[PDB]
Write an enzyme that holds these catalytic residues in place. Structure first.
Site, PDB file in Angstrom:
ATOM      1  N   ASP A  12       0.869  -1.177   0.000  1.00  0.00           N
ATOM      2  CA  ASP A  12       0.000   0.000   0.000  1.00  0.00           C
ATOM      3  C   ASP A  12       0.909   1.230   0.000  1.00  0.00           C
ATOM      4  O   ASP A  12       2.061   1.187   0.498  1.00  0.00           O
ATOM      5  CB  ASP A  12      -0.919  -0.089   1.259  1.00  0.00           C
ATOM      6  CG  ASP A  12      -1.957   1.043   1.371  1.00  0.00           C
ATOM      7  OD1 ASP A  12      -2.203   1.736   0.373  1.00  0.00           O
ATOM      8  OD2 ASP A  12      -2.522   1.216   2.501  1.00  0.00           O
ATOM      9  N   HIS A  29       1.925   3.695  -9.829  1.00  0.00           N
ATOM     10  CA  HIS A  29       1.770   2.306 -10.210  1.00  0.00           C
ATOM     11  C   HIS A  29       3.055   1.827 -10.833  1.00  0.00           C
ATOM     12  O   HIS A  29       3.483   0.676 -10.607  1.00  0.00           O
ATOM     13  CB  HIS A  29       0.585   2.122 -11.168  1.00  0.00           C
ATOM     14  CG  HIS A  29      -0.739   2.385 -10.534  1.00  0.00           C
ATOM     15  ND1 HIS A  29      -1.771   2.991 -11.198  1.00  0.00           N
ATOM     16  CD2 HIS A  29      -1.205   2.125  -9.280  1.00  0.00           C
ATOM     17  CE1 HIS A  29      -2.816   3.098 -10.396  1.00  0.00           C
ATOM     18  NE2 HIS A  29      -2.503   2.585  -9.222  1.00  0.00           N
ATOM     19  N   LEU A 123      11.243 -19.733  -5.956  1.00  0.00           N
ATOM     20  CA  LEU A 123      10.242 -19.138  -5.080  1.00  0.00           C
ATOM     21  C   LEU A 123       8.855 -19.447  -5.605  1.00  0.00           C
ATOM     22  O   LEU A 123       8.653 -19.423  -6.806  1.00  0.00           O
ATOM     23  CB  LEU A 123      10.369 -17.601  -5.118  1.00  0.00           C
ATOM     24  CG  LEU A 123       9.337 -16.763  -4.352  1.00  0.00           C
ATOM     25  CD1 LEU A 123       9.755 -16.796  -2.874  1.00  0.00           C
ATOM     26  CD2 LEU A 123       9.293 -15.295  -4.823  1.00  0.00           C
TER      27      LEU A 123
HETATM   28  O1  B29 Z   1      -0.907   1.630  -3.363  1.00  0.00           O
HETATM   29  P1  B29 Z   1      -2.337   2.288  -3.678  1.00  0.00           P
HETATM   30  O2  B29 Z   1      -3.492   1.703  -2.735  1.00  0.00           O
HETATM   31  O3  B29 Z   1      -2.345   3.769  -3.630  1.00  0.00           O
HETATM   32  C1  B29 Z   1      -2.706   1.714  -5.415  1.00  0.00           C
HETATM   33  O4  B29 Z   1      -1.601   2.076  -6.246  1.00  0.00           O
HETATM   34  C2  B29 Z   1      -3.006   0.215  -5.533  1.00  0.00           C
HETATM   35  C3  B29 Z   1      -1.765  -0.680  -5.446  1.00  0.00           C
HETATM   36  C4  B29 Z   1      -1.419  -1.232  -4.216  1.00  0.00           C
HETATM   37  C5  B29 Z   1      -0.356  -2.128  -4.154  1.00  0.00           C
HETATM   38  C6  B29 Z   1       0.358  -2.484  -5.295  1.00  0.00           C
HETATM   39  C7  B29 Z   1       0.006  -1.944  -6.530  1.00  0.00           C
HETATM   40  C8  B29 Z   1       0.666  -2.378  -7.678  1.00  0.00           C
HETATM   41  C9  B29 Z   1       1.114  -1.464  -8.627  1.00  0.00           C
HETATM   42  C10 B29 Z   1       1.792  -1.906  -9.760  1.00  0.00           C
HETATM   43  C11 B29 Z   1       2.023  -3.266  -9.940  1.00  0.00           C
HETATM   44  C12 B29 Z   1       1.577  -4.189  -9.000  1.00  0.00           C
HETATM   45  C13 B29 Z   1       0.899  -3.738  -7.872  1.00  0.00           C
HETATM   46  O5  B29 Z   1       0.498  -4.838  -7.162  1.00  0.00           O
HETATM   47  C14 B29 Z   1       0.896  -5.969  -7.817  1.00  0.00           C
HETATM   48  C15 B29 Z   1       0.718  -7.321  -7.536  1.00  0.00           C
HETATM   49  C16 B29 Z   1       1.239  -8.291  -8.385  1.00  0.00           C
HETATM   50  C17 B29 Z   1       1.935  -7.904  -9.525  1.00  0.00           C
HETATM   51  C18 B29 Z   1       2.102  -6.552  -9.813  1.00  0.00           C
HETATM   52  C19 B29 Z   1       1.583  -5.581  -8.962  1.00  0.00           C
HETATM   53  C20 B29 Z   1      -1.050  -1.039  -6.590  1.00  0.00           C
HETATM   54  P2  B29 Z   1      -4.173   2.666  -6.050  1.00  0.00           P
HETATM   55  O6  B29 Z   1      -4.351   2.325  -7.481  1.00  0.00           O
HETATM   56  O7  B29 Z   1      -5.446   2.398  -5.113  1.00  0.00           O
HETATM   57  O8  B29 Z   1      -3.793   4.218  -5.877  1.00  0.00           O
HETATM   58  O1  B29 Z   2      -4.083   4.856 -13.285  1.00  0.00           O
HETATM   59  P1  B29 Z   2      -5.265   5.525 -12.425  1.00  0.00           P
HETATM   60  O2  B29 Z   2      -5.167   5.025 -10.901  1.00  0.00           O
HETATM   61  O3  B29 Z   2      -5.176   7.002 -12.492  1.00  0.00           O
HETATM   62  C1  B29 Z   2      -6.896   4.911 -13.088  1.00  0.00           C
HETATM   63  O4  B29 Z   2      -6.930   5.240 -14.480  1.00  0.00           O
HETATM   64  C2  B29 Z   2      -7.108   3.410 -12.846  1.00  0.00           C
HETATM   65  C3  B29 Z   2      -6.007   2.493 -13.385  1.00  0.00           C
HETATM   66  C4  B29 Z   2      -5.735   2.457 -14.748  1.00  0.00           C
HETATM   67  C5  B29 Z   2      -4.725   1.627 -15.221  1.00  0.00           C
HETATM   68  C6  B29 Z   2      -3.983   0.839 -14.346  1.00  0.00           C
HETATM   69  C7  B29 Z   2      -4.247   0.865 -12.980  1.00  0.00           C
HETATM   70  C8  B29 Z   2      -3.470   0.082 -12.126  1.00  0.00           C
HETATM   71  C9  B29 Z   2      -2.130  -0.182 -12.397  1.00  0.00           C
HETATM   72  C10 B29 Z   2      -1.380  -1.004 -11.561  1.00  0.00           C
HETATM   73  C11 B29 Z   2      -1.964  -1.580 -10.437  1.00  0.00           C
HETATM   74  C12 B29 Z   2      -3.302  -1.322 -10.160  1.00  0.00           C
HETATM   75  C13 B29 Z   2      -4.041  -0.496 -10.999  1.00  0.00           C
HETATM   76  O5  B29 Z   2      -5.303  -0.407 -10.497  1.00  0.00           O
HETATM   77  C14 B29 Z   2      -5.392  -1.145  -9.351  1.00  0.00           C
HETATM   78  C15 B29 Z   2      -6.451  -1.357  -8.474  1.00  0.00           C
HETATM   79  C16 B29 Z   2      -6.271  -2.187  -7.374  1.00  0.00           C
HETATM   80  C17 B29 Z   2      -5.031  -2.780  -7.165  1.00  0.00           C
HETATM   81  C18 B29 Z   2      -3.963  -2.556  -8.031  1.00  0.00           C
HETATM   82  C19 B29 Z   2      -4.150  -1.731  -9.133  1.00  0.00           C
HETATM   83  C20 B29 Z   2      -5.268   1.693 -12.515  1.00  0.00           C
HETATM   84  P2  B29 Z   2      -8.228   5.882 -12.214  1.00  0.00           P
HETATM   85  O6  B29 Z   2      -9.622   5.640 -12.984  1.00  0.00           O
HETATM   86  O7  B29 Z   2      -8.307   5.570 -10.768  1.00  0.00           O
HETATM   87  O8  B29 Z   2      -7.879   7.439 -12.433  1.00  0.00           O
END
Ligand code: B29
Ligand code: B29
Ligand code: B29
Ligand code: B29
Ligand code: B29
Ligand code: B29
Lengths: 226, 217
Positions: A12, A29, A123
């Site tokens: 997170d 991300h 792993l």
């Molecule tokens: O960390 P946030 O809760 O702010 C959020 O990035 C969601 C997020 C939480 C944890 C990890 C990831 C993430 C981002 C890029 C790649 C990968 C992520 O989690 C995994 C799991 C397995 C493979 C790749 C990824 C995204 P969000 O999209 O809710 O803003």
């Molecule tokens: O990239 P943003 O967070 O700006 C959004 O386009 C949603 C989105 C688009 C494309 C990819 C992802 C993304 C990428 C990596 C990890 C994860 C993503 O979204 C989620 C949700 C929950 C867990 C991990 C991730 C999220 P949004 O609609 O929330 O503005």
């Protein structure tokens, strides 16, 4: 020396990390993906047998339910290029979560990815996708209920040991340590049954900044909490 | 606003040792700490307090004695008492004192005090599961109609506010098969303070931390 066989991480902080840099969520991300690769690499090189990862989404509440769904699809889609790399690194991949409603093409991609890597000896990487610890217990309960209905199981025969054989990851070493980054001190319906005896380690570090030295710190905290 | 706090009490023995005293002395200071925690919670508007004595016939008799000498006061203080856990094998006299103690306070509207006795989170889920399997076997329930909401209706404390905060004293950072299903969304708070020393200031620290985290997360 850490004696830790299976680590689970609630990742997170990616959005907050980007926000602090004056960057949009997408950059978070990106940096978070790099951090995932780095934690998987660390785990493999440090003799951890299993690493289970859960992406906790702080933004999902502000996203319409139908976007979430499509978000699950991109995940599987991206998971077709990443498997090639996991396989080159001798990683055995498993997806845990409710994937029964995903379209057939996705379900096929997932099974093929697990089949391809099932024989790897490195792993074991478990990725949560549409996972919930309560759902996990409930799907195991359903399997037992089906046996009861068939007439092959009496309700009084159900015990812990039996329900345990039906929850996710029952075939792997039990979870010894759960790490949650990003500052929140909650399990947020990640694993529940499986963490009955695990050490819980919380850190304020945001996921993108969580690196090898932070992972070693958690492992040493574990070794010492023995 | 925290409505239900659960506490994993631990550290009485380590506490007694540091004082150069025996285990019984740690138990005595421990009981006093339970009394103070219960008063504190009731005085600060918490709706339910769930206590789990973590340990790494004498007792059974003390349990009878404890119930017989304190239930009238808990009733007086508008406390509703419940014992959670597998008491199915305690002797019948004790099982009856528990049942009567819960019946006498069943109507109270102040703090609900849940005391774990031979309780485990996995066992709790399993008893709920046995109940649902009975309905499937009876033919009143289809396996695929079982969902989270339904199992939630069959685990301990489903009649109370959801557990908002779990506190564990004594320094360990584990749930140790206390509540599992019930703490899916709870704030978890660990303190190295040993149970006998856990006081109003320590309890307030956990409550303030919960409220601040509710604000931030
Ligand atoms: O960390 P946030 O809760 O702010 C959020 O990035 C969601 C997020 C939480 C944890 C990890 C990831 C993430 C981002 C890029 C790649 C990968 C992520 O989690 C995994 C799991 C397995 C493979 C790749 C990824 C995204 P969000 O999209 O809710 O803003
Ligand atoms: O990239 P943003 O967070 O700006 C959004 O386009 C949603 C989105 C688009 C494309 C990819 C992802 C993304 C990428 C990596 C990890 C994860 C993503 O979204 C989620 C949700 C929950 C867990 C991990 C991730 C999220 P949004 O609609 O929330 O503005
Ligand atoms: O990059 P490496 O192949 O060196 C390694 O980190 C494994 C790894 C690399 C790259 C990505 C991932 C990974 C694994 C599963 C899913 C996804 C991964 O990265 C992303 C990004 C976006 C979506 C999904 C995934 C893992 P390694 O431990 O095998 O060396
Ligand atoms: O509400 P939940 O926390 O149970 C969950 O559905 C949230 C979620 C919804 C949709 C997508 C994701 C997710 C999880 C890990 C990696 C990625 C996710 O979505 C994308 C999009 C693009 C790249 C990677 C990921 C998570 P989960 O899949 O993390 O269990
Ligand atoms: O075996 P003894 O009768 O010598 C003695 O240990 C009995 C005792 C007194 C007070 C508390 C406990 C005790 C010990 C372990 C767990 C729990 C105890 O009391 C409770 C109440 C509710 C749940 C668990 C426990 C034992 P003592 O303190 O009088 O020496
Ligand atoms: O804290 P320790 O794990 O060292 C141990 O005291 C067990 C214990 C833990 C927590 C509380 C208690 C205890 C002691 C006295 C009275 C009560 C205790 O727990 C409850 C619950 C409800 C009512 C009274 C008491 C005992 P022990 O008997 O295993 O040394």
């Amino acid at each position: 020396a850490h004696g830790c066989r299976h680590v689970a991480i609630i990742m997170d902080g990616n959005g907050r990390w980007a926000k602090k840099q004056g960057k949009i969520r997408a950059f978070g991300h990106k940096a978070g993906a790099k951090s995932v690769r780095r934690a998987v690499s660390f785990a493999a090189n440090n003799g951890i047998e299993a690493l289970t990862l859960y992406a906790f989404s702080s933004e999902n509440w502000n996203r319409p339910a139908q976007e979430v769904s499509a978000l699950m699809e991109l995940f599987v889609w991206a998971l077709d290029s990443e498997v090639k790399s996991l396989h080159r690194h001798n990683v055995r991949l498993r997806i845990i979560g409710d994937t029964s409603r995903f379209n057939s093409r996705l379900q096929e991609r997932i099974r093929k990815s697990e089949a391809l890597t099932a024989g790897n000896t490195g792993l074991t990487l478990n990725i949560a996708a549409n996972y919930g610890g309560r759902w996990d217990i409930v799907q195991g309960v359903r399997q037992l209920a089906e046996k009861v209905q068939q007439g092959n199981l009496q309700p009084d025969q159900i015990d812990e040991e039996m329900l345990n054989q039906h929850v996710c990851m029952h075939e792997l070493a039990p979870v010894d340590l759960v790490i949650r980054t990003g500052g929140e001190h909650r399990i947020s319906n990640f694993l529940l049954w499986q963490i009955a005896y695990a050490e819980l380690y919380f850190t304020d570090v945001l996921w993108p900044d969580f690196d090898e030295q932070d992972f070693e710190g958690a492992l040493n905290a574990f070794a010492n909490r023995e």
